[model samples]
Structure formats: C-alpha cells, structure tokens
Target: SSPSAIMEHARRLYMSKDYRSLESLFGRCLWKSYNLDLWMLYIEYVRKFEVYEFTLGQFENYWDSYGLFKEYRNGYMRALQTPMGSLSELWKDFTLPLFQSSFQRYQQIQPLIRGWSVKNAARLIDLEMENRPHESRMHFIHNYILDSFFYAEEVYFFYSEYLIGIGQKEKAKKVVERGIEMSDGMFLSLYYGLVMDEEAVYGDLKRKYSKVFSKELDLLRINHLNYVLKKRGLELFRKLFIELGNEGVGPHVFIYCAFIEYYATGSRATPYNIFSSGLLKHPDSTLLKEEFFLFLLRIGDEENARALFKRLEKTSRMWDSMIEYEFMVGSMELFRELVDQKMDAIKADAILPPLPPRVQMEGILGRYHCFLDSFNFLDLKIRD
Candidate 1:
C-alpha cells in the first residue's frame, strides 16, 4: 500500500519538478524504509529522458503527470542571506575533486568537431549564458548576486575554467592570479584556485594569501562563480548544470551532477581540503540523453543518430522507448517484458508487485486532487 502510495506521490512530485527536495522527503522513503523501488524507478525515467521539451500538462502525463522539474536555477537566491543559507556541508566536501575531474574532462575531450560539432558547442554556450539570467538551474547564481549581494571568486574561476578547457590557458592563468591575489585573506580563496589546472599553489597560497589578505586583502569583492569554475569545484559546477543546455559543456562536466548530488551526498565529511589535492580533471560526460545522440551525430554516425533519434523521439513524445533490433519493434510494454525476462533468466529479476486496489484508490484521491496545489507549494520556497 505504501509503495503504491509512494509511486503515486512520486509521479505527483516528479511531474512538478520538486526533485531537489527528494533528498529531504521521498528520498528517505526509497532509501531508509525501502518503501518503494524509487531510486531504480528514477534512474529508469532519466535514462528514458523523461523531460526533453513539452508543456507542463504534456510533461505530467508524458513524464508521469504534470512533469517534475522546474529548472530551479534561482532557488539559491531564496536561500541567500537567510539564516539557513549555507553551502550544504556535503557539497563543500566533494566540490574539489568533482571540479578538477570535470575540468580535466572538459579539457581532454577535444572538439569532436566532425559533423557540425563545434557549431553545436558554440550553440550550447550561447543558449546557456542567455538562460542563466532566468533559468531555474542558474537561479543559484542569480540568487547569490541579487539576494546575498555578495560576489564569489568562483564566478571568475569559471570563466578561467572555460578558458583553460578551451585552450585559453593564458586567461586561465590570469584568473588564477586574481584568485591567488584575493586568497590573501579569504580562507576559501587558495582552496578555490587549487581546483583548477594548478595544484602547486595550495601550500604557497596558504602561507602567502593568509597574511596578504589579512593585511591588504578583501574577499568581499572577490567573485565566487568565476573563481571556482576557473579552479573547477562542486557547488559552482552544480549551478553550471542548471545551464546545461549549453553545447560547449560536454557530458563529462554533465556527470558531475550525479557525482555530487547522488554519490557524494551520502558520504561522510573529510578534511575540507579536497580541491587542493587535484582530483577531478576536464571531463567527457554522459549526463544527459540527448548529449549521447549529439555525440553520435558528431562522429558522423548519422545512421546511429537517426536510429537512436527515431526511438528517442517516440519515447520522449509519449514516454515510451521504441527499441528495434533487426526488424523487431513492439509496444513499450513488450520492451519492459523482454527486459524483465532477460534479467529473470539470469536470476536477477526484481519484480515490483502491482499496487493494491485500496492503495490505487488512495493515490487517486490524494494525488490527482491536490496536484496543482502541491506544485504551487513546491515552488513556494523560492517565491519570496
């Protein structure tokens, strides 16, 4: 009954894009209580590209009912200056390695510019920048700027990160310089710079910036966004993910979201000294589904793109995966059955029982009726 209720609630929450809050609510239901196989279900949905492009109504019924993501780019603003507003402890821990690994990935994955690829990269960059001002994902940056009324050297670092990743190392070095110069007083300054291409500065900046910033420094004017991106770390990049529509940002950087949001969140805290250790590098990510199709198209695998695109298009449109090998294609349910059969034959099948009659009825009564109200309430946190 609870599983059924959870599934119903999941559909309701997901359709409305209250995903981030899952950590606080349904996440535990899936993890601690084992109430539902939600983690697996969520994975299946994202892999299926539950949200590509569609109206709210279409997203809901299509992705599950109303649609479940609102692009919380600006939610950070809501937290700014508010007493509860602080970097979630988990984020600060993983920020460094994740940043460096991603930065390295971005740097190494040279422009796979075969079939209108660079054009796509540049296209993504333009789209991302424009959307940041208003995009739900980029809203964190906006919140930091407007609500907190403070700057993060991390912002400057991001420009430097792109600069280095794109081969503009000279600019990257300059960004590093600014960060080092600012590091004088800000404890996080040198930590920020070290996440970028240079790890040697940790010890030096520690000794140097501490006194320098204390006497002649000012972290107040330092820009957090650029500094961290330039250095490359976790919290900032998560914000960048909000602007993920940008093509220049590859799948490697894309995967960082899963790394920190999903992977690192559960881990215990370590010395807050990770970014200085040079963990993550420029990435070659696989965060989004379309990025896969785009990558295929970039490699002149037009046939693969066409094939995948046709299936993906169908699935995205109607929430169904249209798989075909040789000449076999059938209803989406058939696809699921085949998968179940294969896993079962291997003795690894995890069958989730169907919801009971009463549970189904409860879901209909509780969820569908309050769907709109829930959606509105979900967005309520950032409204002020």
Candidate 2:
C-alpha cells in the first residue's frame, strides 16, 4: 500500500480503536518494508495495548510466527525492566528453551560458564540429582530439579549469590548438583530469568557447582509467592507434595504455576493467566497436551500430575470461578462508562464548582461517597 493510503487507514483504525485490524495492517507494512525503527515503535504500542496479555498460546503464536523477539536480546536491561509480568516470563519464554538446547546439541565451542567446560558439566549435574535420595527432598522430582542443577552439588553448596534464597547451603548444593546430573548435562542458561529483572539467578559452573546452586537456592525463598490469586493454591500444593513422592516432575510444574500466580503482586492483583510462560516452553511440558502425562513423566512428577488432575476434578464441580483465555475481548464500553461516570467527575475541570468553595468540597466528597455506593452495589450491597 502507498504511504498515504497506509497512513489514512491507520488513522481510521486508531480512532475507532479497531486494534485487531490495526495490528495486522501495521504488522504487514513493517514486515514488507523491514522498518526496524517503526517496528520498534509499533511493538511498544502492541505492548501498550497488551495484546500478549491474553494468552500464553497467543503470545507464542505471535512471537514465533512474527520476529517479535528476534532482537530482544540486544536490550536485556530494557527487556528485563519492561512490566511484562515478572522476570520469569523471560525464563518461561526464553531460558528454558536455551536450557533444553544447551546440552545434547554439539558445540564446536564450549559456552563459557564461570570458566568450566559447559558441555559435560550439565550431564554431571543430571547424574548427581538422580543419585540424591527421595528423603532429601519433599518428593522425587523436587529433589531432582532442586538437587541436580548444572551437573553437580558443589555449585549449589558454595554459591551464596542466588541459590541461598531457596534452601540452606547443604540442601541447596544437593539440589543443584542433582539437577545437573539428572539433566544428563543440561543447564537453563547460567542466569535467572523472570518477568522482572530482580528474579534473575546468577549462576556459573565453577566452585564445584554448589556455589552456583546455593545462590539459586536463595532465590527459592521467593517461591511461595506463586500462589497469589489461586483460591485452591494450598490444595494443589498439597497434591503437589503427594505427586512428587511417586513421580518426579509434577511438583516442579506446580512450582511453575505458583510462580505464575504469586511472584508478581504478592497475591494482591488478579492472576489471570492459565498457561504460565515457564511451563509452556519447557521441553518436557510442551508435549503434555499432545501426549499429556508423557511430558510430566519426562521432567515433572507423574504422580503429582495425576493428583493435580484429581484435585482439578474435585473442583471441576465448581466451574463458575475458572479463569480461561481460549478467547478474549476488553470491556471497552464498560471501561468508558467507568472512567466517564466514576472517574471523569474527578478530573480538574469537573471538580470545579460554579457554585462556592464549601459547596464544591461537599459535592466532591459526596460524589466519592456515591461512587463507593456504586462499588458496593456491584457486591450487592444496599445503600440508605
């Protein structure tokens, strides 16, 4: 399309708030023209509209099909600071893929990780984690990811930077070494990734892996925040422990769920996501919807997964509260009504009283009180 034609079309779409149409049209022009500068500006608008706020599936579709994240690595700080939910969103979206492919893929050049040969370093972690007994962890899988990080326990033990947050030094070391050994040599990148930058766990494959492991374990202190808006968080947590005892992967995925729900707002804001970033991108979990339990069997605790399903079954009877994103649309009309009626009254111009100062203050206070009554009505309260 001609530039003038495109501009006219965009003007119409923007004025109408026809976001779906605008997104496609702008996306096409950006693609065809390869306008990196415009694309960056346009993508910021995309973030502003929060098109990716709908579903993990939708995010992946747009991100993979379009080159949404091609140059994202360039602005790691910008990427981290963006209010994209939590720092873990990067892990869910980025690190796990990097982690899965880190090992098994042959590299002519070994990736530098705290000066250790990363190639077999991860495999050694896998072995160590597999060696950890069930008694060491709340369950088998918990012990594995916890115990077998980066092929050895030494990093888990010696590292105070990141791992220390999750568990004590000895336990942290156990989890790290075991995780690496259990991976048969796989590491999710030598860094902690999150929707917010503070969540990054700094790790490297030196000082016997325990050092790295301990630092990351310290970060584990933040896990309980995962149950933020989840009404049945504790019940699932209970089932998670149960499942971990039998199989090794379910609880870990549950941990991912906890991260999705809690890590952002400390259970204050509504956690509306169903598919979390980390679990969706996990190599083992990506296959679950297709093969289902096979994915859980690979990296999660199978027994815990079943328990999760069972617990879900018990609550399936109460379906009214379920959060779903198979499709979505913003309640723009409702928002406009809210802002116009409830909020617009508070605008500076609206607050001015043509009457008198005392009367204006009284009216302003009266309006807020009336607004409170309206909110109360939403909760089915009666106002006298």
Candidate 3:
C-alpha cells in the first residue's frame, strides 16, 4: 500500500482509540512495506498522550505479546533516523535518549534505549558504506566490522576495507573469498564483482562465465564484464534477453536501461528495438513508456511519436511530455487533479510548512511553456 494510505489508516485508528486495530495495521504497514516515514508516524502516535494515554498498558501489553522488537534493532534505528534527520530538533531528541543513563530513565522508556551500543555502529556503518569522509568512514566501520552484519552481503565490502586501510591486503582478499564461500546466493555475484575474484572455489572469471548463463546470476556478471573488465560484453546480455522470452523472469528495468544505453551508444540499428522489446516485456511500466516516447521525440520520429501519444491518451495516466508539447487538455486536467489531491492532504494534515501548491507540475514543466505555443499538434493552449 502507498504510504499515504497507510498514514490515513493509522490516523483513523488513532482517532477511534482502537489500539488493537492500530497494532494490527501498523505491524503490516511498517514491516511489510519497510517505510521509514510510516514507522515514524506509528512511533510518534504511540508517544502522544492524547491518543494513547487511555490504553497505555494495553499498548505495551499487546506489543509484548506480539514479539514487536527483533534482534536486529540496528536496521530499524538506521532506517528511521533518515526521515527524522530532516527535522533536526526531533532527530536530536531521538538520539539524545541514548546518551541518558538507563537507570535514571523510566521503565516504560527503557526498552527503546536498551542495546544502544549494539546499534550505534549501524548509524556509522550506513554513513561509512555510502562513502563518507575517509577518516569518519574508518572510525565507524572499525567499530562495526567486529560485529557480524548478518543481513547484508555488502557489509563484506566494508569489512574488507577495514583490512585494506590497515594494509592487510591478503586478509582483505580473504574476506571477499570467505564472503563468496559463505554467500547464500543473494550477494555472491555482488562480492564477486567487487573483489573480481576468479578462483574456481571462490569464483573468479571462469566461474563468473558460468553464472552469466543463469537467470538469477547474470546481473552482477554483466556489471563485472562492463566495469571491471572494461568490456561491454553483449553475449550474456543477449542470452538473458532471449531467456526472458521463454516465459523467463522479466528483465528488470535497470537491465533494460543498460541495454538501451549500450545500443544507443554503439553502431547498432534502431535503439527503439531494444526499448520496444522492453515495452513488450513490461507493458504496464510508466517509466519505459515515458522514456521510449522521449527517445522517439529525441530522434525526430514525430510520426511514431504522434501515434504513441494517441495510445497514451487511451488511459488517464498523464505524461509530462504531453504537457510539454501541449498535446491534450485532458492530460493537464488529470495532472491538476492529482496535484490538488496531494496538496489538500498536506494542508489537512497541517504538515508544518505548506508546499507550494503548483510545484508538482512546475518541476517537470519548467522552461517548456514556450514550446506550448510553438507546437501546433493539438487544439489545446495554456492561458497565461
């Protein structure tokens, strides 16, 4: 479900004083979707006396009965901190509780701050892996490297970095090797491309060749082949493309985009073929539709562009390009309704600072108004 839908559901539960319903909905919305803002909303609601004061014990009792907290609390902290960071004072208040002495804090608040040390490294690890300053990155990863990052395979890369910074070159390679050996198939190819390992056991270039032939293993090999090898090898990409035709797993958007980039750059025939095939493979994808339409316009194929625009007209999913070209009044109306709906919700929620009302279309429509007059494809015109 959309975040807005989840928020509205929580709001209804809060207003009705239905703690059980809140618990049931929040559990699914937060964990199933893994949304940061959604989780923050649920937690913030729990903290509010006006909403939960009547059912305080029931809330705690139910949560205890529900096995609410998991071992890897680190994931939740790091995830929620991102949205909280936008509200600086709130973020500070959230983190400030950790520094307070557990003995002095109330029994009710103690669970929130327990195992603070265990998750402290997670905050640093997030920053470190995202390429924070070398000094700061080292500080965090050094602390975190000792702990097992059981959830993610990318952690091996950072752990090895801890070794590399200390000049443990062979040991660092061994980390990648061990990561490959112990990989549960999710990130083996990721680590393979990272370390460029070619060993038969640890999976070097020869082993990578074998992986590229399989559906589940081709993406990383394509990545390795292009980047690490400095070769845009098409053999595996083509293999995957054909495999996707035999009712195989659909090519992911990135894979399609990569092929589009490849064919568009090289001396191949119409890049449209790649995009056309992608559209066939995933007909309902708005992104591919927008991109393919833009590509047609970019290459001066207005005849096909006009035809494609007509197809887009069959549905109410407004295209930014339609607004840019002033192709149809219906699109403008469709987009206006969406923007107005969101703005109404934001205003109703009284979310601190109100967003500029028309900023939605303004972002994609900027500097394109002149084209509205120049193009005479349709009868519609924007009034000043």
Candidate 4:
C-alpha cells in the first residue's frame, strides 16, 4: 500500500485516540521504507505523545524522560540527511533552541543539507529576496556558492537569472560562462544561448562538446527549433525542423514539435498528417495518441475521434476529456453515460490500475468525487 494512504489512516487513528495502533502502524510502515511525508507524520506523533515538556529541573531530567528524545532526534537527523527538496523548512525547525546541543552533529551533516538546498537554488533565492535588500540577497547567494554550491549548475542558473532580472544582462553572461566552466551542463549552455545569440552558442556547443554531450545536443537542437519558430516564424521553423531530422535528431521530436506548431497556426492537414506518422512510428506513445484524439475532437471529426478514443488508454485524463467533449457538444445523455461508466470502473477497481511501488495515490479519489459532483449538478440543471 502507498505510504500516503497509510499516513492518512494513521491520522484518523490519532484523531480516534487509538495510540496503540498508530504506534504499531508507524513502526511497521517506517521499517520498510523512508518517506518524507510518513516521517514528518511520525515525528508529529512523537512530539504529541512521546516527547514531554520540561520544567525547572536538571537538564538530564527533562532531556530523555522516556528515552524518546533520542528517537526524536534520530528521526529529524535521518530526514535531514535525506536529499529532499523541502529540507530548508525542516532545517528551520531543526535549528530551534530545543535542539541547540545537537549543533555539532548537524555540523557533520551540513553538506548534505546544503547540497539539497542548492538543488532548488532558484526558488530559495527568490524566497530570500522577498524582504531582503539587494546587498543582503547578493551576500546570501555568494555565501551559497562560496561555501558549498560553487560547482552546482542550478546555483549558477539562479544567480544568472537574478542578474538578468535586475537588468544586468552583461553580468548574467559572465555568471553563465563561469557556470559552464565549473559545472559544464547542457542547461547552462542553453541558458547561455538565451543570454547571447542562439545560433552562435549552438555552433560553439556543437564544435566543442558535441561528442561528449550528444544526447544533450539533440535536446539543444530541439530547443533551437522552438526558438526559431518563435523568433523567425514558419519558414525558418520548417527548414530547421527538416534539417535537424536529417542530422539524426529523433523523428518523434520532429513529429511532436510539428504537431504543436501546425496546430497552433491553424493548419488542419499538416498536423493531422504529422500525428498519423507519429502514431505509425510510436504505436505505444500515449502522448501522441492523446493529442491525436483531442485534435480529432477539436476539428469535429467525431467518427475518427471515437475510433481513436477506443484505442487510447483509459487514463483518468483521457476519460475526463471524453466526458468534456460530450458536454461541449451539448449531449447531456452521452456525458452522463460516460461519467456513470467511469464511476462503475472506479467501483470495480479497474480505472486506477495498480501503480508502481511508492507512488502516491493522493488525487485520484478526489478527482472521482469531482466527476460525481459534476454529473449531479448536470442532473439538477436538467430537473430545473
């Protein structure tokens, strides 16, 4: 079962004051795996019951009253050591006065937390900029890079973007160049292309790093096509799309991009042909099938749309789209039929197939309720 589901169940048990089962439940679930949500919930449970408040007494008297303080510290320490995106908030909680004695241990594990925070350097820097002055923000970013994140591509991107946002494009260029030299990732090169000339950066990257970064270079080419489409329009976009295909950048990429462009420009036959060719090549690509199905519906080709829908996988999104199509066409009967069929599938446990292990089933049931409520509203409208 999913950890999120178990966490919800544990919450209900806590509300019912069934501490014995909550303890047993958390013990069993935590033994098998490490989940951030479950760990946070377990910690919250410990704070509520296991850990106690201190009075005016000796430090040792309050420190480990039930031997649970050690367990509590272990929980927080293990969570901090795990490289999660939410470590900044957890670190804030950990630095509270109650945990001052654990500072030495935290020092030993500081690198792990810093590395985790650097992974999301852009968002954190933006958050820090909310109330701080420019000098303080610059100091914060400098400390991040000078201390531990100097070699992180994300930190460089964050710094460069901040510079660009402040109208310092030239400084941003220098930062990106430094990032390229230090971390040397495709993303940094792509960001450089945005700051400088796209074609010039493309040539430089191809000549220098093509052999070492072949797969990334393909992605760069795809991005270049998008940039050309936006800047230079259809003629150049088509030319580059064909040239990239001949250069052996994948056909699926060509088909996908072509479908998006042609559809946006209101070309019927071109997008349809692109979708057909893509489906012929990538028979199992749900993305291609879903787009094709929507395209057919958009163009009022109901016969072909229904034909495509029959072959498409019954994902929640696809089902919702079909129900929406029926509603848009003013066919209330068809909409209700589709919703009822989906509700039955949910009841029969056939809609949401067994997910791969550890994935959260958080929103699926919520979406089911949304569908039911929508259909009920439609029924009320019909009665009125």
Candidate 5:
C-alpha cells in the first residue's frame, strides 16, 4: 500500500477514538512499510494515554507491541557512559538529566526509599530504576527502553552482550536465537558466534543450517572455513583453492580476489596457478592483472611481467589497467616511458585510464593516484 494512504488511514482511526483499530492497523502496516512517522504517532499516543494500570508493566506492554525503531536506546541507556557508535553525545544529553531527576526523586522519598532492602538495588538501579527512582517499580524505564528497541539487532546484541558479561551464557543463547528469528537470520554471525562459543559443531551447523535465501549462511561457511584453513595451514587452504578453481570462479570478483590474496602470500607455484586461472575467468579484472603483474616481478621475472603487460596492452578494454600496472610496479623509468609513448595515441582516441577495482582501490589508493597523476604532464583527459 502507498505510505500516504496508510498514514491517512492511521490518522483517521487515531482521531476517531478507535484506539484499538488504530493499534491493529499499525501492527499490520509496520512490518511492510516501516513508516517512521506512523511509529512516532503511535509512540506518542501510547505515552499520552494510560494503557495499563501498572506504570512499568504498562510501558513494557506498549513497547513490546509497538516497538519498531532503535530510538529507544537513546532514552533507555541515557545514564550509561558507554560510548555507542555515532550516538555518544546524544546518550549523555538525554541520560544525564534523567540521572539527576532520578536521584532527586530518591532524596524526596528517602523515608520510603531507605526502607527498601533489595540486595541488588544497585544493579536494578543501573538497569531499570535509575531513570525513575520515585517509581516503586524497579528498572521500569530500562525495561521500556530495552523492550522498545528489541526490533534492532544492535539492541539484542547489546542485551545479549550484557547477559554474557554477567555470566549468563544460557540466557545469552536465548537472546541470540531471538535476534536471529527477529531479524530473519540476518544476525547469523552473532548466532554463529554465540553457538560456537557454546561448543556447537561448526561443520555440522554449516551443513545443517545453510539456507538458499541467506547470504549470512554463505558468509558463515566462508568464515568458518577461513578460520579452519588459516589455522591448519597450507594443505587445507591449497586444497580448497584448487577445489574452487577446478569448478572455476563465479562472476563474483570476491571469490577470485580471495583466492589471489591467499595464494599471493604462499609459494610462487600457487600464486601463478590461481592467477592464471583468474585471468581465464576474469580477464577484464584490473585487480587480478595487478596481482599477476606484481607476482611476476616478485620472482624477478620482469621480462615475463613486461610480456604479460604487453598482452594486456593489446586488449582495448585493459589500456588503463595496463598503464596502471606499469605505474604500480613503481618502475619510474618504465612509468615515464609508457606515459611518453602512449599519451599521444591515447589523447587521439580520447581514451583514459580505467579506475582501479574497488578492492584494490581500498588497499592502494595512494599509489594508484600517483600513477594517475603521471598522466597530467601530457594533459590527457579521461573520457566518460
């Protein structure tokens, strides 16, 4: 349904004093639309109206049903000094004032408050009651915040992490499962880690739990295999490398790049083999060519490296890759000669260097730009 139509429907139902239908309507629309404005309206309505007689339980029930956003963390953990990603300052601003108010309430009701003898009063205070000490219910605000943000994996992780730190692994596992189910296995890494820490067999889980709809499972298998292969050394890593190469690389550059990076640090034979296989599968991949070019130079085989670069030069698509390869080898003489020799023909055809592939760009940003600057002397323009 269109978001505007949903909003209008919600607004109409809310204004008509049909709060029950309004809640039902939002519950249906929320999973599909994720309408934040509708969410805010729902939040405000719940806050303004008394849905439950008991304050803490009321807040908990309201959030458990209507929680769709992670904004709860700001209000919930405001008194917490822990620096959360980009929201650190926000935590202080929202929480510090609440701490002052909570203690002030404590001072006013000291007679009633001092009569309390809860052994874990401190822990309860930090977790739930710190935001509202005047209230008889323990940790009411904390429960509200935690419940409202359960829709986010971060909150689940945060809650689960707390459970783990306080020696509650069993409870942590339950939260992990809840997170995986809530997020549709998108938090499988957390699930995997939690399960693995509990001594679950990774291989069994890999075969048992892998699903066609999930990239998380694929990455889980890759990550588990990577850990196993790295620890077991050359034979295992090499066997997997060949096993995949024999099937041939898929269209994804990541699979091929992973092979090259692993083999590049191994013996020369494996590096050459995987690279040759990669070139056959991904001839136009600029990063693979760079790897192959550097691999040849590592063996002091610059002659063959130059020949490989020449073969790349013959391909119209790899002209930028070719020039960049020579420039990347840091052979300033070679870079100068190539730039001087090729700039005129390149300008005539209006050809320009291709940008490095994303993976290589991340690793070699500085050196690649230096190669690009080599073109500036000839005033060659890059064509779109």
Candidate 6:
C-alpha cells in the first residue's frame, strides 16, 4: 500500500484505541520503507502516548522508573541511526532533556550531534554579537573561528568584515588569509580585496591558487568587473573585460559580464556584439542564446527575441524562461500555448516522480557513523 494509505490505516488504528495494531503497523511499514512523514507520525504518537509525564521528583528517577523512557530513547536513536535529511530538529528534541537530566550522557552524545550544534552556535554567535561590547564580541567571533575554522567559513568572512569596518585592514587581511588556508575561503577574501581596492593581494592570491580555484576565480573576476563598472567607469571595466577574455575565461563568463555591462552602461551595441561573437565561437551555447533572447526582450526587440526563441534549445529551463517572457508581456495566448507544450512534453517523456528527499548525512554524519562503530557505550547514569 501507498504511504498515504498506510498513514490513514494507522490513523484509524490509533483512533480506535488499537495500540497493538498501530505499533505493529508502524513497525512493518517502517521496516519496508523510510518515509519521513510516516516516521514523524510514529514518533509523534509515541511521544504523546508512550513517554511518562514529567513529575516534580528526581528527573533521573522519573526516567529510570519508566521503561518507556528507555524504549523512547532507543526508538529515537534508531531513527537517527538511519540516514535522513532534516533530522536536526529530532536530534534537538531528543537531546535537550538529556542535557538537563544527565550532563555526562549529553557529553557522550555531543560528538554525534556536534554538526548541528556548531551550526546552532554560529547562529547564536551572530545573534549575541548585536549588543555585545567590542572586546566581548571579538571574543565570541575569535573563539568560534578558532574552534570551528574548518566548518564555519562565513564566520571568518564576518570577522574580516568586522575588522575592516573598524579600520583594521591589516588584521582583516590576516584573518582572511587564515580562512583561505583553513577552509574554502577564497571567494569571500577576493570580494573583500575588491572592496578594499587591494588588487595586489587579490592578484597574488589568484595567481598562487588559480589552478585549484579556477572556477571560483573566474566567477570572482566577473564580479570584480561588475564592481569596476559601478565604481571606476566603463573604460576600466572594458579594460578588465578584455584582459579576462584574453586570459581565456569561459565564453559564458564573458557573455554574462557583458550583459551586466550593458545593463550598467546601456551600451546596446557592445553587448550585442559580444553575444554575437560568443555564439559564433560556441554555436551550441544555449546560455548565450538565452541571455541574448532576454537582452532583446529588455530592449523591446521582440521580433529578434521570437526568432532567437525558435533557435533556443528546448530544455525545461529554456521553456520556463519563454513562458515567463510571454507572461511578462501579457500575451495570454502564447503563455497558454507554451504551458500546454511543456505539459505535453512532460507527459510524452513520462519521467518518474521527482527525486525523494535526500539524506543529508555525508559531511558530519559520515564521520559520526565511523565514531559510532568504534564507540563503546559507557555507564552515564546520574547519582544524586
């Protein structure tokens, strides 16, 4: 039976006070398939019905006296052991009480849950920085970066930006350098370097790291070009563009940079020429065609846009763009026609349902799984 049908049957079982049947149904269904909704429903039912109410007595006694607590913890652990996306909330719900009831147990479980906690800490760090004194805020930011340098790239950027804001350019540069060495930190550093007009630093880092950071470097160069267009003017912007083009960045990069330039300066001929030249060099470039089509539309040249649309590749994205174009222009008939065409294509192809919700266990959970295999359970019962 489908998940919905199973869920409905489980609901009926629960409503009829058929606890045994409901438990069996959930166990069997969950053993067969890993549906998030079904798992959540089962968890909700267990939490509401199985776990004992918290009393004013000793917390550990309350937990220990009820075998249901053990059952609940085991069930939650089993669910967590199964790789799934969006389990942070479940982990939090299960662990918060552990922190209060048994700090030692929480300590034991900390390594397993550190991924989510580190993210939460970063959020709290940001929130707590608002009203903090300079030294105190720096303490928080500095310690967070020191501890979580590998996982928290944004904190490094934030720290650098804060340093720069305080006119501590030298300190900011060092922080950014540390970030680059420790994590995927080139992009943010390059952006800051551009903002600070420190091209020598940007140039040295780009040359040193260009081989490994080619794609990111290319993107940053385009971003810098746009920055130049806004700050320095068209002449320097054109100079940078020509230099980047000669350095042989991807044609799409040039096309996109040129599009931004056109938007900035409203120089229609220049971007049109670049688009034409790009298409001539790379005829199979759908992105180039798409941008050109949009450019024509922006300039109220629909005749050319329509011509370009016919030549544009028939991908879902391309069709969606065309559909958007028709909708924007209030061409209801053309919009409907494109929508039907898209639907017909989808039906004919009969693609399976969209992918299932992906399990997000790779980075932190992947490491946690290894820890789990080697970890021996220690007695963590609290003593009054």
Q: What residue runs in model 3 are displaced by over 4 Å at the alpha carbon?
A: 1-119, 122-144, 147-154, 164-169, 180-185, 197-269, 281-287, 295-303, 311-320, 327-384
Q: Per-residue lDDT tens digits of candidate 6, residues 79-116?
A: 34322233444466654444333433334334433554
Q: How many residue pairs clash in each candidate?
A: 67, 89, 4, 0, 3, 0
Candidate lDDT scores, in order, read 0.35, 0.34, 0.44, 0.56, 0.47, 0.55
Indicate which candidate wins on TM-score.
6
TM-score of each: 0.18, 0.15, 0.38, 0.47, 0.44, 0.50
Q: Which candidate is the best by lDDT?
A: 4
Per-residue lDDT of candidate 3, residues 115-214 (tens digit):
4322433344443344333544354333233323433344555556566666776776766666655444434444445445542332353245442344
Cα error, residue 62 of model 1, in Å, equals 40
RMSD of 6: 21.0
lDDT of 4 by residue, 145-193 (tens): 4234556665666666566667777877887787777674566666577
Ordering by lDDT = 4, 6, 5, 3, 1, 2
Question: What TM-score, to 2 decimals, does candidate 3 have?
Answer: 0.38
lDDT of 5: 0.47
lDDT of 1 by residue, 1-384 (tens): 234565677776777777776545544654333221454455544653222232221221111111132231122222221112112322242235543443343232223222322233333233334422123333222222211111334334444445555576775666556554543233334434444444444334434544223221212112222344455766774464454333232223332333243344543122111211111222221123434444444444446555545443221211122224211534567567645543553464332222123132222122322322322211121121
> Between the candidate structures 1 and 3, which one is better when assessed by TM-score?
3
Score residue 331 of candidate 2 by CA lDDT.
Answer: 52
Candidate order by decreasing TM-score:
6, 4, 5, 3, 1, 2
Worst 10 residues of 5 by lDDT: 375-384
Selected candidate, larger TM-score, 2 vs 5: 5
Clashing pairs in 3: 197-204, 198-204, 198-205, 199-204
